[PDB]
Design a protein around this nucleic acid. Sequence first.
RNA 1: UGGGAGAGGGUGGUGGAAUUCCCGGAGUAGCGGUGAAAUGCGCAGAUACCGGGAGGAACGCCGAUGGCGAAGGCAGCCACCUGGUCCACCCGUGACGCUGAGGCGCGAAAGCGUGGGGAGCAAACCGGAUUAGAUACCCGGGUAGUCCACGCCCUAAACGAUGCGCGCUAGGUCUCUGGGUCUCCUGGGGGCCGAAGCUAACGCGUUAAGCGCGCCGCCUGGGGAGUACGGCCGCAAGGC
Lengths: 114, 68, 100, 88, 275
Amino acid sequence: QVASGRAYIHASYNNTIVTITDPDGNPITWSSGGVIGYKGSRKGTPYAAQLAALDAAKKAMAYGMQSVDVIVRGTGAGREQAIRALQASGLQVKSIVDDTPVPHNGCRPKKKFR
Amino acid sequence: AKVKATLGEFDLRDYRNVEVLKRFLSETGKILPRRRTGLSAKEQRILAKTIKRARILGLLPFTEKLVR
Amino acid sequence: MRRYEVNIVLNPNLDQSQLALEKEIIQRALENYGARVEKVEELGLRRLAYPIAKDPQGYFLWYQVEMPEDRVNDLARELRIRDNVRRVMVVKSQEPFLAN
Amino acid sequence: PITKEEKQKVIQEFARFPGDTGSTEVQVALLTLRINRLSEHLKVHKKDHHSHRGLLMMVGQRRRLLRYLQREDPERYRALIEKLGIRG
Amino acid sequence: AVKKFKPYTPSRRFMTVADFSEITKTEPEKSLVKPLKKTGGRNNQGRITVRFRGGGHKRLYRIIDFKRWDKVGIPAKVAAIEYDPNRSARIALLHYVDGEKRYIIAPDGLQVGQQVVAGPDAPIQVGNALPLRFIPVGTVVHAVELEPKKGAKLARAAGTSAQIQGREGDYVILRLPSGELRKVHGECYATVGAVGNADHKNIVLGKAGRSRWLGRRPHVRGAAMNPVDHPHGGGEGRAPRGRPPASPWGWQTKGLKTRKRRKPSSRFIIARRKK
RNA sequence: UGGGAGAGGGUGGUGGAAUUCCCGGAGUAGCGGUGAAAUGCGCAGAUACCGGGAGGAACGCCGAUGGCGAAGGCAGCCACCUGGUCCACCCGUGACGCUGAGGCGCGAAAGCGUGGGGAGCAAACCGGAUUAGAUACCCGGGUAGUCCACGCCCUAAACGAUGCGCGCUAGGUCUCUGGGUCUCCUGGGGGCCGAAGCUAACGCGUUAAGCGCGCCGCCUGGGGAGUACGGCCGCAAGGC
Ligand SMILES: [Mg+2]
Ligand SMILES: [Mg+2]
Ligand SMILES: [Mg+2]
Ligand SMILES: [Mg+2]
Ligand SMILES: [Mg+2]
Ligand SMILES: [Mg+2]
Ligand SMILES: [Mg+2]
Ligand SMILES: [Mg+2]
Ligand SMILES: [Mg+2]
Ligand SMILES: [Mg+2]
Ligand SMILES: [Mg+2]
Ligand SMILES: [Mg+2]
Ligand SMILES: [Mg+2]
Ligand SMILES: [Mg+2]
Ligand SMILES: [Mg+2]
Ligand SMILES: [Mg+2]
Ligand SMILES: [Mg+2]
Ligand SMILES: [Mg+2]
Ligand SMILES: [Mg+2]
Ligand SMILES: [Mg+2]
Ligand SMILES: [Mg+2]
Ligand SMILES: [Mg+2]
Ligand SMILES: [Mg+2]
Ligand SMILES: [Mg+2]
Ligand SMILES: [Mg+2]
Ligand SMILES: [Mg+2]
Ligand SMILES: [Mg+2]
Ligand SMILES: [Mg+2]
Ligand SMILES: [Mg+2]
Ligand SMILES: [Mg+2]
Ligand SMILES: [Mg+2]
Ligand SMILES: [Mg+2]
Ligand SMILES: [Mg+2]
Ligand SMILES: [Mg+2]
Ligand SMILES: [Mg+2]
Ligand SMILES: [Mg+2]
Ligand SMILES: [Mg+2]
Ligand SMILES: [Mg+2]
Ligand SMILES: [Mg+2]
Ligand SMILES: [Mg+2]
Ligand SMILES: [Mg+2]
Ligand SMILES: [Mg+2]
Ligand SMILES: [Mg+2]
Ligand SMILES: [Mg+2]
Ligand SMILES: [Mg+2]
Ligand SMILES: [Mg+2]
Ligand SMILES: [Mg+2]
Ligand SMILES: [Mg+2]
Ligand SMILES: [Mg+2]
Ligand SMILES: [Mg+2]
Ligand SMILES: [Mg+2]
Ligand SMILES: [Mg+2]
Ligand SMILES: [Mg+2]
Ligand SMILES: [Mg+2]
Ligand SMILES: [Mg+2]
Ligand SMILES: [Mg+2]
Ligand SMILES: [Mg+2]
Ligand SMILES: [Mg+2]
Ligand SMILES: [Mg+2]
Ligand SMILES: [Mg+2]
Ligand SMILES: [Mg+2]
Ligand SMILES: [Mg+2]
Ligand SMILES: [Mg+2]
Ligand SMILES: [Mg+2]
Ligand SMILES: [Mg+2]
Ligand SMILES: [Mg+2]
Ligand SMILES: [Mg+2]
Ligand SMILES: [Mg+2]
Ligand SMILES: [Mg+2]
Ligand SMILES: [Mg+2]
Ligand SMILES: [Mg+2]
Ligand SMILES: [Mg+2]
Ligand SMILES: [Mg+2]
Ligand SMILES: [Mg+2]
Ligand SMILES: [Mg+2]
Ligand SMILES: [Mg+2]
Ligand SMILES: [Mg+2]
Ligand SMILES: [Mg+2]
Ligand SMILES: [Mg+2]
Ligand SMILES: [Mg+2]
Ligand SMILES: [Mg+2]
Ligand SMILES: [Mg+2]
Ligand SMILES: [Mg+2]
Ligand SMILES: [Mg+2]
Ligand SMILES: [Mg+2]
Ligand SMILES: [Mg+2]
Ligand SMILES: [Mg+2]
Ligand SMILES: [Mg+2]
Ligand SMILES: [Mg+2]
Ligand SMILES: [Mg+2]
Ligand SMILES: [Mg+2]
């Protein structure tokens, strides 16, 4: 059981996934739009993400989670709402940092990304 | 809030002056535009070129995470 | 013969005896590659912006020198030949450019 | 590159008179110098074509002047391309 | 380079030969040659045990040095680079200051007149030999021992080379010319550089005769034989295989792996060859 | 002679971000993708997360309406080798100039030959959808190729759809880079609006499409057709 930990948000246009880890970085539990119960396009919605971060927080609290640090990746439309859900969840939110991977003109993207 | 103003006489070509240079980077690590640095056309290139040099030398970051 | 500014970064977690050993190879190397040292600034350790060889710290050296033009590259190669030598950046010496 | 001294050694060797610069002889000899330097550079760097243009321009330039000198002073021409080892 | 011919005969049209530019001595060091007992592919029973062999040009075997840790610390000059008919690579004549002369496989870049040496202290320069552990990770290397003091076994063919990928305990990690990732012992000696004569593979033999010179007798397809002779034998008119393609001895020859499974050296191979 | 600016070109090194694969830890019921789905991937442990390793390719912020080059074109960083060019001084040569039929070189992408390399991407091809059909557009895959070396090909909306040089014909403003005394003046580039004048109009206008001289290239109704025949070049595709 861990009091302080990490909160990772992978939120894309198609879905939002939330994983709660220990301060070492080992996941303790995770959730997503599918885990809450949605399918198809509904997974990408803000409301889906809200439920996701919660179920991610609820399970986390049950293992002794109190404090978290929120790490954000992805520019989805359900992003900020995930952040809202974690604060109003009963978790500490000691910090919130966006760490979306951006290349320095690395690999050529797919056709739809040019 | 132009950075060029808030400093005295300083060398643009000086890649080991980490304390001067660190002021020219954004909180996210990116090199700041002229509209923020107050440098002229010619000065910007000298600045940019030496900032990159320093990054290789470990004195300056290539990127830094965005805290809220 | 031209003026350059050799920068070198070494393993911070060495002892002083090991530290000196590397410097010995270095100082002879400069001599062998026609590099005649002028100024010199050994700033010791320093906090790095990012880890180098999985290491937050880096030991800095610096030499203003005058060596033949055609010999600078091979020197830089020979300088990097050590495992404790982690960065070698030779730079064409240039008069400062002043702002304000 | 070509060092300032070497340039002068050449400048002096082909000056018509002690103060002479930019005369036909001096002009050609200077050109001949850059040419034979470049000629070597391009022998190793077969892929550097942008510089080959310069080589051609120089070669073009040296050619035009030699034609001028030959027109004006045949003895002075045949002495210069001999003392430089040029015509071929 | 490789040397092309004009097509003044049907064969010279495609025939290409080595350029021999790197060769400086067309005579073998007499005290380093011994007669090569040609076999014809037959064992001590007189039985052919490797088919289609024989009738090649006569050869004198050069005595090559695949240990080199034999003479640690004693430098040597590269007196000549010679042709060796028993290998794909070229060989280098070493005149030791010791006064001893030995042959090594000639690395690419090795200059006649230069000096080389073996030992833990050796300068990491082309033609020097060191235990693997004292060679900088990332530098390419050839003539590698597989086990300590057992002799150079790896990367000996023309143009070949191994590369050090990292270290792990007493062992270091080489990427063999096949691409296989293997742990080789740190005390195993190796010579820095790649093998020379890398142009070797671009040679076009050019005619039936050239293979005969090389001691390679004609090879006969199973399909062109009879049912007694070969699994692919027989059939009225031309015929496809009619079964999974096989060797004359019956085993399958397309894909079927053959390395012994429970081999003790499996523990040391990390990644079997690519492609 | 002295000075400057720049992704001009070539060789060798080298730095970090990211994608992929692989190894370890930890973790569980989905992930992915779309208009919505499905194919696909996942309890044989995926996604998401942390650590390590491997490899290729492109260099984010700076970055610009910017710079450089004859054009094609050129962008992390370092060094070497190298071209063009501008300014100031007004020292040297004495018309040595301009253009240029042939010739010669260079010439994006795709394409070809030999040998490397191969992460991402992706013709062809396979599958899932859509559809009346969908040999497409969208989605899951995916081989050439994209990358390197050397050698070929020599095409284009290779465009400013504007050949090069030169003289003369208001200015206003933004910008880059030099030199003065630096208020500003004076050069050389990059745009915008505009005197005169041009133009069928649109628009051009000291970066002329204004007014003039020189030289080269080219046009002479649409299609047939950049086809045929011949010739020259090419390994071929094909080019002139
Ligand atoms: Mg979705
Ligand atoms: Mg400085
Ligand atoms: Mg090193
Ligand atoms: Mg010229
Ligand atoms: Mg002539
Ligand atoms: Mg050769
Ligand atoms: Mg031939
Ligand atoms: Mg012949
Ligand atoms: Mg021939
Ligand atoms: Mg014939
Ligand atoms: Mg024939
Ligand atoms: Mg051979
Ligand atoms: Mg042979
Ligand atoms: Mg030959
Ligand atoms: Mg040879
Ligand atoms: Mg003999
Ligand atoms: Mg004998
Ligand atoms: Mg005897
Ligand atoms: Mg024998
Ligand atoms: Mg024998
Ligand atoms: Mg016997
Ligand atoms: Mg018997
Ligand atoms: Mg017997
Ligand atoms: Mg056999
Ligand atoms: Mg036989
Ligand atoms: Mg041989
Ligand atoms: Mg072959
Ligand atoms: Mg072959
Ligand atoms: Mg033979
Ligand atoms: Mg055969
Ligand atoms: Mg046969
Ligand atoms: Mg038969
Ligand atoms: Mg029988
Ligand atoms: Mg039978
Ligand atoms: Mg049978
Ligand atoms: Mg059969
Ligand atoms: Mg048959
Ligand atoms: Mg029969
Ligand atoms: Mg049959
Ligand atoms: Mg038959
Ligand atoms: Mg029959
Ligand atoms: Mg039949
Ligand atoms: Mg048959
Ligand atoms: Mg037959
Ligand atoms: Mg059959
Ligand atoms: Mg069958
Ligand atoms: Mg073994
Ligand atoms: Mg000058
Ligand atoms: Mg795993
Ligand atoms: Mg990771
Ligand atoms: Mg930009
Ligand atoms: Mg004057
Ligand atoms: Mg006069
Ligand atoms: Mg012309
Ligand atoms: Mg022409
Ligand atoms: Mg081309
Ligand atoms: Mg291409
Ligand atoms: Mg091809
Ligand atoms: Mg190819
Ligand atoms: Mg083929
Ligand atoms: Mg290939
Ligand atoms: Mg691939
Ligand atoms: Mg389909
Ligand atoms: Mg269908
Ligand atoms: Mg149908
Ligand atoms: Mg697709
Ligand atoms: Mg794909
Ligand atoms: Mg194909
Ligand atoms: Mg092919
Ligand atoms: Mg093809
Ligand atoms: Mg174009
Ligand atoms: Mg355009
Ligand atoms: Mg233009
Ligand atoms: Mg046209
Ligand atoms: Mg038209
Ligand atoms: Mg023209
Ligand atoms: Mg000024
Ligand atoms: Mg202007
Ligand atoms: Mg206008
Ligand atoms: Mg008017
Ligand atoms: Mg008119
Ligand atoms: Mg009108
Ligand atoms: Mg104007
Ligand atoms: Mg202009
Ligand atoms: Mg008109
Ligand atoms: Mg008609
Ligand atoms: Mg017509
Ligand atoms: Mg045609
Ligand atoms: Mg055509
Ligand atoms: Mg024809
Ligand atoms: Mg044409």
